[PDB]
Structure 1
Amino acid sequence: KLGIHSNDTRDAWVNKIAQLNTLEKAAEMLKQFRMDHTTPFRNSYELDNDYLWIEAKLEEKVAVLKARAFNEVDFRHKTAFGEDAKSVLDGTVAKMNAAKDKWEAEKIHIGFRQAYKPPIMPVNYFLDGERQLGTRLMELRNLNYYDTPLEELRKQRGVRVVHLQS
């Protein structure tokens, strides 16, 4: 079974997810999944065609478990890991404002998403974070956007130039 919308990979993960019946285990697996399969910094591209869908199924499980385990105040203000969401948000924004350059900034924003994307952090705090982190990242990136030659930019990004035609 190798389909686009339905295949063995997806089925296999649905089964793995069905066996996550504790908030802490499920939340930890979601974050691990995000480190392994999301963003251009993912540890691997093996699940490139199904990670987006599998991630959502894992989120569903974490959300369901969190709502059952947390009291009302914690559901609104605590991350799935028991951290105070406002503190994390403020601490991350503080780091972003201290960012020396656009390279440090992108690491902060991207990492923040991989670690706290909702069922982990309450959406209210998370999107407030997007608002603030996204602003600084753009302010740093869009300054003198064209000054660096492609030859040098490729080096800065650290890609391996495989082939060039002009």
Structure 2
Amino acid sequence: LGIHSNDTRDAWVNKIAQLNTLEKAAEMLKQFRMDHTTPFRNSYELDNDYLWIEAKLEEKVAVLKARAFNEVDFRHKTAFGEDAKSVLDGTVAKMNAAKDKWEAEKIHIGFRQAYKPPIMPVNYFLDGERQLGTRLMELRNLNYYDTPLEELRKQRGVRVVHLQSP
């Protein structure tokens, strides 16, 4: 029950083995990424294992999507029937139609949370990564320092717990 081997991990191991459907496993992954990844995750309860769990989960979805899609689909269709390129161009669209860094970052993180392989084919995903990621930076790094920490903390919406500076 430590760093690399623990009940929590063992739990999901057994929990994942029960997935006999691409749809189920695919959805679970989605819900897992919504519940345990990124700063916007729903909870930090699995902070010490979610990364290792998520992979054991991408695995199942990987194997299943394999023994389910046909070549053309495995290369162009998400494990959700979604048309990879469609979603891609669809997201880059909203990204470039973003008013500010706050809007931008919200799209990118959601994109990764929803279509991270084995959901979307890696080819499209990383192509998105280079497009979305680029835009995100452009907005963020523009007058990166202009805002004062006080204000920035407010914009980020953090809850200042303690401050000390001599």
Runs of 4+ that moved beyond 2 A: none
Cα distance between partner residues in 2 of 1:60 and 1:128: 22
**Residue 52 (structure 1) shift:** 0.2
Cα distance between partner residues in 2 of 1:119 and 1:13: 18
Instruction: Give CA deviations for 1:25-74 in whole Å, capped at 9, x if unaligned.
Output: 00000000000000000000000000000000000000000000000000
Cα distance between partner residues in 2 of 1:117 and 1:68: 19
**Residue 5 (structure 1) shift:** 0.1
TM-score, normalising length: structure 1:
0.99
Identity over aligned pairs, percent: 100
Say whether 1:33 aligns with 2:32.
yes
Question: How many aligned positions are there?
Answer: 165
Report the counterpart of residue 134 of structure 1 in structure 2: 133
**Residue 98 (structure 1) shift:** 0.2
Instruction: Give CA deviations for 1:60-108 in whole Å, capped at 9, x if unaligned.
Output: 0000000000000000000000010000000000000000000000000
Say whether 1:65 aligns with 2:64.
yes
**Residue 158 (structure 1) shift:** 0.3
Instruction: Give CA deviations for 1:105-148 in whole Å, capped at 9, x if unaligned.
Output: 00000000000000000000000000000000000000000000
TM-score, normalising length: structure 2:
0.99
Report the counterpart of residue 110 of structure 1 in structure 2: 109
Question: CA-atom RMSD, angstroms?
Answer: 0.3
Structure 2 residue runs of 5 or longer lacking an equivalent are none
Give the secondary structure class of the aligned counterpart of 1:69: coil
